[PDB]
């Protein structure tokens, strides 16, 4: 999971 | 927004759509390319091809279970492009590049057309 | 093999599947969550959820145009997960995390369940 | 395009  | 994003989600979805295609699950169309038949999901074809997008948004053609392609279309070229649609991997070779490019032009798959043009230019 | 790969292909496919969902094109099921209704593509639901994969591979349920979820399922939690299926982006917030995690557990979306557990553990 |  990432900060888009 | 303040959403979080799962990096591998799109690739995982496409992998599962390919698994459903391999097992012939919820395929709703057969693409006829001369003597050869290819089963697929209308939504994936539309998502990958400008030609299929136009065909399946048409009020009469949206309901057809069989689509016949132009007789000049090569079945192997179509098979390679169908595999690309469901996997992101294009099996481009010296012996098939002309058929793959002509099929990608017909199907309106501009990124495939672009890489075929570049690979041909390099060989000239 | 000796294939070349188009990096953005999976993301582009998912973006187009979401555009077809927004315009209600070739959606073949309505998911009923208490008073709320959500239209979707069966193939995308199966590709994202262990629960939908089981439902639509069932010889009788594969043909249903309406699926009713358990009454304990929260419509907002479902809406957030449906948006995630079609975009890879999860709108996880303090006010919805419990509903999102319970819905992801029910839908069998293990990567969502995992991030919800980690976000909850950090707040404890 | 890349070599996967
Ligand atoms: O080279 C390409 C690849 C392609 C795909 C599609 N597909 C869609 N485009 C916009 N909204 C929707 Cl809903 C879909 Cl399905 C249309 C044109 C082209 N051209
Ligand atoms: O957490 C998850 C996400 C998920 C998706 C699916 N989907 C599929 N799996 C295998 N082959 C096929 Cl053909 C599909 Cl469609 C099954 C289980 C789970 N669990
Ligand atoms: Cl393309
Ligand atoms: Cl997930």
Q: Which domains are seen in chain B, by residue range? A: 1-124 (3.30.710.10)
CA–CA dist B48, B86 (Å, integer): 9
| C:29-58 residues touching chain B, CB 8 A cutoff | 41-44, 46-48, 53, 56-57
Q: Which residue of B has its CA nearest to A1?
A: B6
What H or E segment, with its residue span, contains residue C2? Answer: none
Residue B40 tokens, joined: 């697929």
Query: What radius of gyration, in Å, describes the C-alpha atoms of chain B?
Result: 16
CA–CA dist C109, C115 (Å, integer): 11
Residue B6 tokens, joined: 């799962």
B31 and B67 in contact (C-beta within 8 Å)?
Answer: yes
Strand C66-68, strand C89-90: pairing = unpaired
B49 and B109 in contact (C-beta within 8 Å)?
Answer: yes
The helix/strand/coil state of C6 is: coil
Cα C56 to Cα B49, C41, C61, C74, distances in angstroms = 26, 11, 6, 22
Chain D residues with CB inside 8 Å of B89's CB?
4
| Rounded to 5°, angle at Cα C9 from C8 and C14 | 100
Does the beta carbon of D4 lie under 8 angstroms from any beta carbon of chain B?
Answer: yes
Strand C4-5, strand B89-90: pairing = antiparallel
């Amino acid at each position: 999971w990432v900060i888009p | 927004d303040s959403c979080i994003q799962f990096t591998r989600h799109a690739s995982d979805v496409l992998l599962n759509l390919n698994r459903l295609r391999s097992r012939d699950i919820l395929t709703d169309v057969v693409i006829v390319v001369s003597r050869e038949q290819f089963r697929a999901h209308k939504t994936v074809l539309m998502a990958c091809s400008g030609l299929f997008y136009s065909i399946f948004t048409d009020q009469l053609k949206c309901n057809l279970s069989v689509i016949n392609l132009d007789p000049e279309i090569n079945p192997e070229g179509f098979c390679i492009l169908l595999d690309f649609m469901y996997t992101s991997r294009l099996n481009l070779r010296e012996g098939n590049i002309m058929a793959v490019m002509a099929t990608a032009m017909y199907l309106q798959m501009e990124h495939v057309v672009d890489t075929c043009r570049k690979f041909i230019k390099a060989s000239e």
